[PDB]
Amino acid sequence: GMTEYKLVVVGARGVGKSALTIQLIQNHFVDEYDPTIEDSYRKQVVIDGETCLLDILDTAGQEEYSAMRDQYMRTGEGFLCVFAINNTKSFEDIHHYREQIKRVKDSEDVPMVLVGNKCDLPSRTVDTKQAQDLARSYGIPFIETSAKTRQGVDDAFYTLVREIRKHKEK
Ligand SMILES: Nc1nc2c(ncn2[C@@H]2O[C@H](COP(=O)(O)OP(=O)(O)O)[C@@H](O)[C@H]2O)c(=O)[nH]1
Ligand SMILES: [Mg+2]
């Protein structure tokens, strides 16, 4: 089979995980998608000439059993850590997602991309500079996105794939 990249989209409720994923996969913006639905989505794409499958888990938070969370973190190869630029608590929550994914995978080298979503909105509580500072500390890319206008969306997911490739080659 073509190479498959198992991607996982994490972040606080309301940041745009579902909207980002549906924009990537289906090329349209959702105003409303139940915050409690967690599902996986698939798309065959070409990234830097490679035809590959993206298998993307749009997470929604607590699971029936914590074992289910740990399972998707172990199977996931790369993580989009999403906050919204108008939600400071969602940015603060990134510290927890960073930790938890490393903790479950028992690894210091986990492919991740920091995503500041909703950049089409002028309303902003997290300046680009502060997010750059956090991404610098993690040694990962930082991309601002809008699921609404599509700005940055392919970049966020394709960059994550490229981070996975860099990890695999070691
Ligand atoms: N303006 C704007 N609204 C967004 C964007 N992404 C998501 N939203 C809205 O933010 C709310 C939460 O989005 P959703 O995808 O359900 O967030 P989730 O809980 O992280 O899955 C919804 O009303 C979306 O329409 C974006 O980039 N721009
Ligand atoms: Mg959602």
Curated annotation (Swiss-Prot):
Changing residue 35 to R: In CFC2; characterized by a defective GTPase-activating protein sensitivity and a strongly reduced interaction with effectors. GO terms for biological process: actin cytoskeleton organization; cardiac muscle cell proliferation; cytokine-mediated signaling pathway; epithelial tube branching involved in lung morphogenesis; female pregnancy; forebrain astrocyte development; gene expression; glial cell proliferation. GTP binds at residues 11-19, 30-36, 60-61, 117-120. Changing residue 23 to E: In CFC2; exhibits an increase in intrinsic and guanine nucleotide exchange factor catalyzed nucleotide exchange in combination with an impaired GTPase-activating protein-stimulated GTP hydrolysis but functional in interaction with effectors. Acetylation at Lys-105 prevents interaction with guanine nucleotide exchange factors (GEFs). The modification N-acetylmethionine is found at residue 2. A motif (Effector region) lies at residues 33-41. One of its GO terms (cellular component) is cytosol. It catalyses: GTP + H2O = GDP + phosphate + H(+). It is found in: Cell membrane; Endomembrane system; Cytoplasm, Cytosol. Changing residue 147 to V: In OES; somatic mutation. Keywords: Acetylation, Cardiomyopathy, Cell membrane, Cytoplasm, Deafness, Disease variant, Ectodermal dysplasia, Glycoprotein, GTP-binding, Hydrolase, Intellectual disability, Isopeptide bond, Lipoprotein, Membrane, Methylation, Nucleotide-binding, Palmitate, Prenylation, Proto-oncogene, Ubl conjugation. It is a lipid-anchor. SMART domains: RAB (SM00175), RAN (SM00176), RAS (SM00173), RHO (SM00174). The modification N-acetylthreonine is found at residue 3. InterPro entries: P-loop_NTPase, Small_GTP-bd, Small_GTPase, Small_GTPase_Ras-type. Belongs to the small GTPase superfamily. Ras family. PANTHER family: RAS, DI-RAS, AND RHEB FAMILY MEMBERS OF SMALL GTPASE SUPERFAMILY. Ras proteins bind GDP/GTP and possess intrinsic GTPase activity. Plays an important role in the regulation of cell proliferation. Plays a role in promoting oncogenic events by inducing transcriptional silencing of tumor suppressor genes (TSGs) in colorectal cancer (CRC) cells in a ZNF304-dependent manner. This is GTPase KRas. It comes from Homo sapiens (Human).
